[PDB]
Structure formats: structure tokens, C-alpha cells
Amino acid sequence: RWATPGHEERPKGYFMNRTPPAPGQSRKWEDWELPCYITSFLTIVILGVGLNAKPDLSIETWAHQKALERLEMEK
Amino acid sequence: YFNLSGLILCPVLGSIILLFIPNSRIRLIRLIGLCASLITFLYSLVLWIQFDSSTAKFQFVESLRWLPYENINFYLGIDGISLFFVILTTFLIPICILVGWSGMRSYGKEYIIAFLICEFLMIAVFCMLDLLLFYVFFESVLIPMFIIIGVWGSRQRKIKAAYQFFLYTLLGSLFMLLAILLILFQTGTTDLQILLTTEFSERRQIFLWIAFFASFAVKVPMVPVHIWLPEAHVEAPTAGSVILAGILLKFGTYGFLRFSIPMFPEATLCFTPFIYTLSAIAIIYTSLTTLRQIDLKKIIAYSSVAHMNLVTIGMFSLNIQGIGGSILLMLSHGLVSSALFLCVGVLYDRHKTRLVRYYGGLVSTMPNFSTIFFFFTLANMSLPGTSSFIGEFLILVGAFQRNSLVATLAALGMILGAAYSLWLYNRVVSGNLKPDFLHKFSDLNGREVFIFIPFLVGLVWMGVYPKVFLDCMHTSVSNLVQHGKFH
Amino acid sequence: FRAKVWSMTGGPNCRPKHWRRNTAIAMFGVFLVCIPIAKLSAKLEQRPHMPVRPIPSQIWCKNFGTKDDYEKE
Amino acid sequence: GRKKGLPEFEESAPDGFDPENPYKDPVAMVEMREHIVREKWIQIEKAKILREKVKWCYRVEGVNHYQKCRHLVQQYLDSTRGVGWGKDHRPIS
Amino acid sequence: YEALAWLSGGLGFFVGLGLLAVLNDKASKVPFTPRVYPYDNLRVELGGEP
Amino acid sequence: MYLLIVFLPLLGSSVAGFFGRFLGSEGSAIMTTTCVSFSSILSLIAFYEVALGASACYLRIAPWISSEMFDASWGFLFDSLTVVMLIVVTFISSLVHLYSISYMSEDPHSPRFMCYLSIFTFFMLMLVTGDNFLQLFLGWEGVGLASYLLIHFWFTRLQADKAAIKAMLVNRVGDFGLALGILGCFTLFQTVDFSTIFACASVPRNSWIFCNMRLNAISLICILLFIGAVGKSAQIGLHTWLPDAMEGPTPVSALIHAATMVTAGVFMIARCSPLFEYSPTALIVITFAGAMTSFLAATTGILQNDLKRVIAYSTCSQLGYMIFACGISNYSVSVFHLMNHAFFKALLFLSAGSVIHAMSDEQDMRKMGGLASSFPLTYAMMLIGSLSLIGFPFLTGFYSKDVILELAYTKYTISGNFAFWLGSVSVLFTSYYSFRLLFLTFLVPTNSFGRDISRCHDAPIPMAIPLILLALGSLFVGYLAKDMMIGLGTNFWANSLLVLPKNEILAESEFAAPTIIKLIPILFSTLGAFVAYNVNLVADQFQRAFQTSTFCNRLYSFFNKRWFFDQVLNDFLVRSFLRFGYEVSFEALDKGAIEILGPYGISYTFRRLAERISQ
Amino acid sequence: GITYKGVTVHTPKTWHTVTGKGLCAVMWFWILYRAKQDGPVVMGWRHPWDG
Amino acid sequence: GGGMETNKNKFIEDWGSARENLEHNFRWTRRNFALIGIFGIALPIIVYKGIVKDFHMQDEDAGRPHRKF
Ligand SMILES: CCCCCCCCCCCCCCCCCC(=O)O[C@@H](COC(=O)CCCCCCCCCCCCCCC)COP(=O)(O)OCC[N+](C)(C)C
Ligand SMILES: CCCCCCCCCCCCCCCCCCCC(=O)O[C@H](COC(=O)CCCCCCCCCCCCCC)COP(=O)(O)OCCN
């Protein structure tokens, strides 16, 4: 049974139970979708190029450099 | 110059615009409310960009006079701890708007008024350094939650549910107010920076610590007083009930961090075993009570009670890692419990039973809901790889380093967490399908599918890489642990 | 009633007609994203030991025999 | 409004704080409190760096790690006596 | 409740046979001597001081 | 390259689960199995470049928990010990994947099965390659999660649901000890990594303050770690789950019940070798528990009359043997028996599944009789596997059981002699019920029904190649690995396994053998063969059914109900917990007792005080 | 396989009998092969490797 | 058959909204006194004593005198 074509014209079930419209027209986005989608994109970009733009200043890297230049003073 | 003033003004403008909008224009009310909430969320996120996690002192502060002699005044600001709570508060509310989006016609515009009012109200709580006004906004959240529970409650028995949630809060609130009066009359002001630098009397320390504990033991469910949360929490709308365990439950627990631990260094040490002997038996008793439960909402609330009693152990165990783990666990719980109540409320909005007996075999249908529910149960199941486990592992580490006995009882909590949550999952969405009761039912559409996406991504992000959350607040936790003593 | 539910992981007997075409894409999809895992790992796998015999991993790796001392970490 | 480099607050000592009367100069007590943690994090970090020293020593030497890392094992065990706030033996800082 | 009566006997055999291994004292029945290493039982390569 | 060993099964599982509708029931079967086979080839390459080309590989991806001096990282430890288990897990996982595609061709929800299998493969790869306790803990919990998911593969099946739930609770109670162990060892070293504690793990010699009284520190840590390994090795403490775990599909059971999750608890001890040897107290209790569990399982399996149930007790007996091997500082025979076991019990599991699903899905001994001549292939396979199981002289299983029993005899400690006695008397039981399995099936008149025999169909070719590979393995691997890894000081382990100078008894385990004890377990094996053949083939007129008055039916029930553990433990612990969670906590603590302050407690109090105040 | 009064057994395929026989004969030969070369190891008589 | 809601069986409604209010039953009885005095005043006291004893033993090992608490 590794050569016969499948007996399925389309994957069963509807994605989010939303019945596709007649062919040719769009999905008719809902009122909440557009602001929520643009805010999701803004969140993604802010957390992407904002988090990996903040200088690494903390109590960890400052202490790291300080102890790296202070453990070497054993004499 | 994205300061804290705008973060509080924006929800106020959103509420004010909504007040003068006709009820007929239901299209505009929801759109503008959601837009205001999302703008507030982005304005909170941008603060994380300019946080400057280096200084021990406080971040952006706004000072507004409140008394003729500038004795006490509105003094804003975050240090390292309330920042994440502000972000999560600004993030949960748009989810509240989205979950109650379809049925807004019956709710009206008054539904969004209460939510936005509580929104900037809880925003003004976390970033409020002045001690007294912290109490003013700490109990200001009574009215919005009272209204949400009562006006849009599910069943008719909501009348008795709200009374407990109110009066239990008022008792502790006024008990704290007396301590605030004693502190102000003794010291002279209530500004946090000064009041942390005042030599107190040991006999006075114990009484004031008890007075603060009078209310802070009600917000976090303790053994003597935890009846209000289940009764007044099963009987609230899903959009509203998702922040009783979301932000309304983190006031007292976080209030311990800001107004109890550095405030009374010599009293928390003397009262440490009492908190241990309360929370350790709470995590056992509440967890056992959870097993013999039938309502779908109450089990999640009891699991939340157990999680808060667990985080209380790790908070009073003064460790640089204990407090950080407490904050991580509180954020993770705010995510997972919110997700779980949405998951158990989407079932109610379709069938309206709230009984595990009727539910069964929900894997043969609505599989996406089953997958989401399984993921959030695993998150509540305390598995490594999710943000929770990072949460309670540090709690256990901090407790064991101080006391060996308390750690074993606390870990009994995560042992017993597999007895009720997994049983609920296998008894709701993995049983034998029964067509007698659930004749017909749909699956999640595009709204609730997108609702869980931020929850899932934040859960995984803070579970596999919690570095940024710990990176942003190592200075503040270090300053909080080292206080009063000099060794 | 099985056709009504989506069953995101596939239905019970989900047998698409062009399943071979999708499997070819899926296998190609794994390979194309597997290269970044292999490429990013080349800057890793520090093994200070030198094997007694040559292995075939010297072409894409250089983190062996270099991290000898432990006084400048 | 900062330089692109790592910040440096102060290193020598806070002059205002007097141990005999800890609550005498509130302005300088917070400086002492923050200086304590900013100096204890240095010890924590050097403990971490010596931990990685030991870890790479065990990862290089082989079976003879009971006689070629004892000079670092004794430098680790004594560094955990007063590191951070982790065990009831608080360091005498 | 009758099962607990069988439970005591079932584990009793294990511990009872465990005690019997004490009544024979196979420790003193070794046919050889304790193992010895050079250099103070390999003191340098097991710790101590160089 | 080394990241491809671990991440490819996860990637295959994720893509199969997310796009199980884009790929048919065979697309995922040929895709996930191909990815797992590629991972197996990568593991073989790593074994060639590490085990023989002795140079361990080390790495660190990113910091997981970057708190203060609690450095948690995503690094892995590609060590000589680890790569052997890489081979063991990858080869068996790929063979099981090939095995399942034939079995699951009729089971509807096919792609979900390979999705779960690949999740398990990824989790245990993460566990074995791990180098930090907490980062090993995610694999430890993920193995249990995948075990639950796979036993819960049949959501309709009520028995599977209860079995899965009980397995999760008992495994949680088990690894409670290990979970305590991570932070127990952390409070003495202020670190969680492996390379920084195995460097100096003998220095600490202080005590602690536990719940009741002050005890030792290292010994307590090792005790906690062993209690954690109890949950994932079905020891005397909590072994309620494995006997009831075979309520799900068969191909997974060849991978979860007898091949790999078997290795988790023993590999806990094996990985942390230079921690238990410095805690002699923990070693002795480990030996006691291992011997007790091995004997208990060996005498448990004999009465049961099911294919999967009895062999689960054989697996538990091997668990006890391996736990003892890890309890006497003789970890060499532990890993050697692990490698042998993953062959000669996975093979038997595949054979049992092949004969079960080809006989109208029946797994019984009382009902099914003999059909050996109907098909010789998988019976020859299972006969080879059984011969390895008893450890016939000069076979794969002999080279492990013989040496482990000799090591048990040599050590004269109070636990060595007792556990050697227990192992010697358990050899008789294991050789008895193994041949009982060989005899009650395929060597008796057929007692089955007349419809199932007509509907007979042998093992398909794709499911027979894994059996062929396992048969080829567990006939030469024992001879090939006897010299190279247990050879009196073989130089490939390096730091992977460390044995203290004091407790090193290997040379006198071979050159001081009395020759009257080394070859005795073969004598118990042949005696068990004789008695089993006599009872189950000829002398069964009275030796089979005992219709006496008393003390003989109860003897039957005592071992059938496995020492009433499922009865006494249930009623006295979980039934009591469920009773007192409703009649104590919900009665005299919160609801009813202190509720005299909420509704109907003070509400009626102010319906009298406030009333008599207007007048 | 020929059909009877209830047992209409199907004969095993060509490769499900000869493969089994020719693979089991290997193990049967290997038992004696290891009992001859390395056989003298564990018997108590004639210890090999310079003995 | 067009009702998405449950049928709300009569025998299940009482079972549901009976355990929700147990104040009437759990007011005054003999077993309640024993249960409360053995699991709300007894166990918390025992565990508190255990915790303070553990703190005292930790103090003694370090040598510092135990705090009054
Ligand atoms: C320790 C936590 C780690 C992170 C958690 C994720 C680990 C996997 C957890 C999910 C595993 C799958 C469990 C899904 C629920 C099982 C029951 C169920 O609802 O099945 C659904 C869902 O099916 C699935 O199993 C989907 C699996 C999706 C999960 C794939 C992701 C797993 C890998 C991610 C791990 C994280 C990777 C690391 C990230 C950095 C549909 O199955 P059907 O075959 O269609 O049968 C239903 C019957 N009927 C057809 C009639 C409707
Ligand atoms: C189904 C479609 C869903 C689409 C989502 C994406 C699809 C993939 C989903 C899989 C899950 C991925 C989740 C992200 C995992 C990231 C793990 C590593 C993150 C990390 O620690 O590195 C940070 C990267 O910053 C970053 O850029 C991180 C950006 C992550 C954005 C996620 C936005 C979620 C917002 C949720 C808010 C919830 C609030 C709750 C409090 C900075 O690390 P660093 O400091 O070391 O910098 C380095 C300077 N040298």
C-alpha cells in the first residue's frame, strides 16, 4: 500500500472551524485581528531589536571584569 | 522620555473616551478599548528597553504633592521587581478584553470601563514608593473587582461570593492602616527611601510586622484565611476571574517583598519559623483538599493557592536566589493560572456545566483545545523546560540552604501536584466520550487560538531562557537581601 | 463525524493524495534547517584531548589540542 | 544618556557611614548597603571563575586529577566559606 | 486486613535471611589478604599532600 | 555534528506532530524513522571517534539559570560512558521505529505514535548526554512524561488511564529523592555541574541537620540519589507501576519497559560514580535493595500467565541485579549487563509482540497452546533471546551473569554474601519461568480456538529486520565486549567510571574462583529446566493443580497478587489520603470549622445583635 | 498448509523458515566454537594464557 | 438535538450544589472535635517544634547561641 494514492481530497476538518468562503474572495478579516496583529508584530520587533540592543550593563559583567582584573593581583 | 506618567494616563484616557460613547456603537467601543489596552502594553514594554538594570536606586520617578507641607506625596518609580509585574499587568488586560470579545453586546461599555479602571489601578500599585498611597491604591482595586464579580457573575449565588472577598480584604486593610498610622506618627513621613533608613524598636518591630501580616496573609492564601478565594473566584466571569489569580493575587505576596522584608529586618528573622509552619502545612492541606473536588474552576484556584503558599516559603527564606526564584515563580504562575482559567472557561462558554462529571472524552473532538490544555497542565504539573520549574527549583534551593525540614515539606507540594492536575486532565479531555450530555460542541476558533499564543511563547521563553528576567533584577534582589546587617 | 474535527496532528487514517510530495518537502525541510545547527556547532565542541588516531572531524572543527592550559580561563 | 562602556560607580569606600552608629547618616547608609553587595558580587564572580578553572582542570588532566588540581581545590573549598548569601555561615564583611 | 499479615511474613523472610548472613561471618572467611599499594597506599594519587 | 545527534529526533517529532495531516500514516513513519536512523548513524560515528579514539567531547550552548554561582548551562558531556549508551539508545530506538510501522499499519492514530517515540528519544538523549544535575533532571522528568504519554496512547482504554496516572504518581514519589539530591549536593559544593564535583568530591567530611537528627552529608546525598533511582528502576520501594505498565501498545513497550528507561536509574549511579564510592553506607543499602528487588521479581514472574506481565518481572529482576552491580563499586558488570539486556530483552519483546499481534491479539499462557512449527523464524529468535536470558555457557548473557555472580561471591561484606545468596537462589527462579514461557507456549497441544489458527499470518519482512539485527547482536556482542571493557584495567573509560583503590576486587574474582561456585548457576539453570519440563509437559496430573484444603490456594494468591502490595499500599496510603482529604481538611480545617467566620458563621450573629438595638 | 476440520493452517513463507534455520545453525555452531577455543578458560582445567 | 448546553440531570445537580455548602453538617459532633484537635492544633504545633529544633541544632553546630524567636 506504499504506491496507491491517498483516498482524501482535502485534510479533514476546518482550521479554527472557519468554513472557507467561495473561491476568489479573501477571508474577510475581523475587527480585532488587525490591531492585535500589528501589536504582535510591534511586540516582536521591540523585543527582538530592543533586547539585543540594550548594552550588557548589570552586576554580573561588571563584577566579571572587576574580578578578572582583581584575581590577577596575587603577587 | 517614555516616563511612568503616560503609562498611567493612557488607560485613563481610554476610560474617559469610552464614557461618552453611545451604547449603540458597539463596533467602536471594543475597538478603541482594545487599542488603548495594546498601546498601554507597548508603553510598558518600551520601559523594559530603557530599564538600565545597573543602579541600586529607583528608576524613573514622578513626584506630585499630596499634603500642604509635602509631608507625603505621590512618588512613582520601579527598582527591579515591580517592573515585571507592571509588564505582566499590562499584558493580561488585553487578553481579558479579547476573551470577552464575542459577548460584548450584552456586557456593554461598562465591561471595559471596569477593566481599564482596574488596569491603571494595578499599574499605580506596583510603581508606588510612598507607603500610605500604596495602601490607597492597594485597596482601591476593591471596587472594580466587586463590580466585575457582581454585575457579570455567572450564577445567581454571586451575592454571597462578593461579600467575603470584600470584607475579608477590608479587615486586613484597616489592620494595616493602623500600622501605617503608627509608622507615620513615629517617623514623620511615609516615603520609602527614608522610612527604610529609620532605627526601629524591637518590641515595635514585632507588632508592626504582625499588623502588616494581618492583610498580607489574606492576599496570599494562608491556612487561617483562604476560604474567600475559591468561593469568590469560581463565581466570577472568565475575563474577570482570570485576574483574581492574575494580578489581584500578587499584591500581598509582592507586598511582602517591598514593605515587609527590607522594612522589618529584625522581625522577619524572629517570625521565620511561623511562616514556614504555616506555608508548609498549607501546601499539604490545600493540595489534599484539591483532590476531592468536582467543580472545574475550584481545582485550578486550589492549585493556585498551593503555588502561592510555596512561593511564600521561598520569599521569606532570605537568599539572593530564593527571592529571584520567588519572582520567577510568581510571573510563571501569573501566566499559567491565567491560561488555565481561560482553558476551563472556554468550556463553560459553550456548555455551561462547570462539572467534571459531564466532561469526558474531549480528545476525540476539539483536539487543539486538548493539546493546549495538556501543555498548560504540564506547565502546572511542574515540569522542567517550562517557566514554573525554574520558579520552584530556586524556592527549594533557597529553603533547603536555610532549613532542611521545610524543603522536604515544600517538595511534597510538587509531588502532590501530580495527583489532582493530571487526574483532572485525564478525567476531562481523555475519558470515554458520552453523547448523553455533550450532544454537540465546537473547537477553538481564531480568537482563543490566538489568545494562548502569547501565553505559550512567554511560557517557553521564560522556561528555557530565564536569563533576561534574572539579568534585569539581580541588583535589586541583592540590595533587598542585604539590608540592616553589614556582614 | 471524524471529518468535522480538524485533528491538527492528522486524522485517524489521514491519507493525503500527494503525501509523497509533502514527505519530500518535509525531508527537504529538515535538511535545510539542519545545516544551521551543524554550522553553528562548528564554533563549539571544545575537546582539549588529542585522539591517538585521526578522526574525520578535523575539517569542520579546530577546537581540539588548543585549550591546553587552564591558567588563563 | 550614557557612555557605551561599562559603568563605574565607586570603589574605595563610603566615608559617611560610621559602624558605631549605623543609623546616623541616612544618606550614606544606602551607599554602604549598595557597596556591600557590589563588593560581594566580586567575590561571587571570582568564585565562579575559579570554579571554571577547576572544571577545565578536571576536563584536561584525566585520571591524575587527584594530584594535579589540589592547589585549586583548596582555592575553591575556602572560597565557599563566605560567598554570597547562601549558607548560615555569613561572611564577616 | 488479612493481607497485612502476609505482608509481615513476606518482608520477614527477606530481613530474616539478611540476618542469617550475619550469623556466618563471611568477612573473616577471606582466603586472601587486604590489597596494598605502593607509596602509602597511593597517597599522592588519592589526595593528601605532595 | 554532535548537536545533530540530539536535535534531529526532536526536529522530526516536532515536524511530524505539527504536520501530521500533511503527511500520511506512512509519510511520518518513513520520515521520523529515517531521522532516528540518521541519529543512530551519527551515534555510531561518535562511538568510533570517542570509544576507540579516546578523546571525550565537551561543549556548552547557553546559560540556562544564570543566577549567582549557580551556573546552569545547556552543555552536554559526550564522554566515553555516555557514548556507549548513545549507541544503546539510538540503535534500539531506530529498530523499534522500524518495528512499529508494521504493527501500527492497522492502528489508526499512527503518526502520533512515532511523534511520541521521537519525543522519548530526544528526552533520553538529552538525559544521557547531560552534564548538570538540573539539566539531567529535565531528561529524568521527560522520560516519565513520555512513558505516561505512551502508556496513555489509548485514551478510550480505561485501564490504560489509571495505569498511566498511577505510574506518574509513583515515579514522582520515586524521583522525589533525586530531586532532593540535586540541591542536597549543591549546599556542600555551591555548584551543580559534574566536572567540578568529580574533581573534588571526597573532600567534604562534615554532617548536617536533617528533619529529625544530624546524620552524614555525602551518605545522605547518595541515599537521596538512590531513592530517586528507585522510582525509575522499579526497586523494592516503588515498583507498583512496571507490572501494570503493559496496558498500552507493544512496540513502545520494547523501548520503555525493557530497553532504555530501564537504564535511567542504573545510569544515575553509573554517571555519578565518584560520589557513591565515597559514601560506603549508601552502597550497602543499595546492595540490599537491589538484591531484594531482584529476588522479589524473580519469584513474582513465575505464577503469572501473560506474555508481557511475566517478562516485566524478568526486567525487574535484571534491574535488581544491575542495582547490586552498582552497589558493590563493580560498575563494570553493571554497564555490561545493561548493554546485554538492551539486546536480549528488546529482542524478546519484539518476538512476543510478533507472536501476539499475529494471533488475533491474544497474550495468554492458559489459553494459547503450541504453534511452533507454524512459523520458525520468530521462535528461533525468541529461543536465542531466552538462551541469552538464562545465560547459557559461552553466550552473551553468560558473560554478564557469571561475572556479576562471581563478584557478588567475592566481596565478603555483610551485603555481598547475602546478596550473592539471593542472586544464586534467584537464578533458579529465572531459569524456571523463562523455560516455563518456552514450554507453556509452542511446546504444548494447542488449547486456543479454531478461528484464530485459520487466521494466521507470520511476521512481515519490515518488522523482521530489527529482530534479525538484534539476533546478530546478542550472539557476538558479549564475546566482543568481554575483553575490551571488563579486562582488568582497560584504558578507554578514563574519567568516565572511577573505582576507588580500596574497593577494587576484580582480579581475585577470576584468579581466586573455587570453580565449585563459578559454574553453579548453570547447575541451577539445568535443574530449573528439568523441573519446568517435568511439571509443564509430563508430570502435571498433580503437580499443576492443587485442590487442597488451605494454605495452598492462599499461596497461589500471595504471588499472583504480588505480595498484596497493590492492596496494602493502596488501602493504607492512597485510600487514606483520599478519605482524609475530604473528611479532615475539608471538614475540620477550612470548610465547616473556620467557616464559622464566613457565611452562616457571623451572618446570623448580626441577625440578633443588630435586631435588638432599635428598641 | 493443507486445510483440516478447523485448523486451516497457512504454511510459513519461504524466507520465514530457511532464514530461521540458517541463522539458528550459526548460533549452534558458535556455542561449540566458543566451547573449543575459549572453552578451556572456565572449566577448572588447563587455564589458558600461559598456564 | 440543537442544544449545545448540558442536560443538567437532576440527580447530579444536588450532588454538585450540596458539597458546595457543608456548614450545616459540620457544626458540632464528636468526631469533628477529635479531627480538629489532632490535625489543626496538633500537627502545626509538632511541625513548628520540629522547625525550631532544627534551627537550634543548626545554631549549635556553628556554635552561636540559639535565638529566642
Ligand atoms: C516537559 C514539557 C516539555 C514541553 C512540552 C511539550 C512536549 C510535548 C507535549 C505534547 C505532546 C503531545 C500531546 C498532545 C495531546 C495528546 C492528546 C491529544 O489531544 O491528541 C491530539 C493532539 O495530537 C498531538 O499529539 C499533537 C502533538 C503536538 C506537539 C508537538 C510538539 C512536541 C515537541 C515540542 C517540544 C519543545 C521543543 C523545544 C522547544 C525549544 C490529536 O491527536 P489525534 O491523533 O488527532 O487523535 C484525536 C482523535 N481524533 C482524531 C478523533 C480527534
Ligand atoms: C505560533 C507562532 C508564534 C510565533 C512566535 C515565534 C515562533 C517560535 C516559537 C517557539 C518559542 C520561541 C520563544 C523564544 C525563545 C527564545 C529563547 C532565547 C531568548 C533569549 O534569552 O535571548 C534573548 C533574545 O532576545 C529576543 O529577541 C527574544 C525575542 C522573543 C520575542 C517573544 C515575544 C513574546 C512576548 C510575550 C510577552 C509575555 C510577557 C510575560 C511577562 C536576549 O538574551 P540576551 O540578554 O543574552 O541578549 C544577548 C545580548 N548579548
Curated annotation (Swiss-Prot), chain D:
Disulfide bonds: none annotated. Keywords: Electron transport, Membrane, Mitochondrion, Mitochondrion inner membrane, Respiratory chain, Transport. One of its GO terms (cellular component) is respiratory chain complex I. It comes from the Eukaryota. Residues 1-24 are annotated as: Disordered. It is found in: Mitochondrion inner membrane. Complex I is composed of at least 49 different subunits. Accessory subunit of the mitochondrial membrane respiratory chain NADH dehydrogenase (Complex I), that is believed not to be involved in catalysis. Complex I functions in the transfer of electrons from NADH to the respiratory chain. The immediate electron acceptor for the enzyme is believed to be ubiquinone. This is NADH dehydrogenase [ubiquinone] 1 beta subcomplex subunit 10-B. It comes from Arabidopsis thaliana.
UniProtKB/Swiss-Prot annotation, chain E:
The chain crosses the membrane at residues 3-23. Its main location: mitochondrion. The keyword Cell wall biogenesis/degradation does not apply. Disulfide bonds: none annotated. It comes from the Eukaryota. Keywords: Electron transport, Membrane, Mitochondrion, Mitochondrion inner membrane, Respiratory chain, Transit peptide, Transmembrane, Transmembrane helix, Transport. It is found in: Mitochondrion inner membrane. The keyword Cell cycle does not apply. GO terms for cellular component: mitochondrial inner membrane. Complex I is composed of at least 49 different subunits. Belongs to the complex I NDUFB8 subunit family. Accessory subunit of the mitochondrial membrane respiratory chain NADH dehydrogenase (Complex I), that is believed not to be involved in catalysis. Complex I functions in the transfer of electrons from NADH to the respiratory chain. The immediate electron acceptor for the enzyme is believed to be ubiquinone. This is NADH dehydrogenase [ubiquinone] 1 beta subcomplex subunit 8, mitochondrial. It comes from Arabidopsis thaliana (Mouse-ear cress).
Swiss-Prot record, chain G:
It comes from Arabidopsis thaliana. Signal peptide: none annotated. It is found in: Mitochondrion inner membrane. This is NADH dehydrogenase [ubiquinone] 1 beta subcomplex subunit 2. Its main location: mitochondrion. The chain holds residues 9 to 59 of 69 of the full protein. It is a peripheral membrane protein. Complex I is composed of at least 49 different subunits. One of its GO terms (cellular component) is mitochondrial inner membrane.
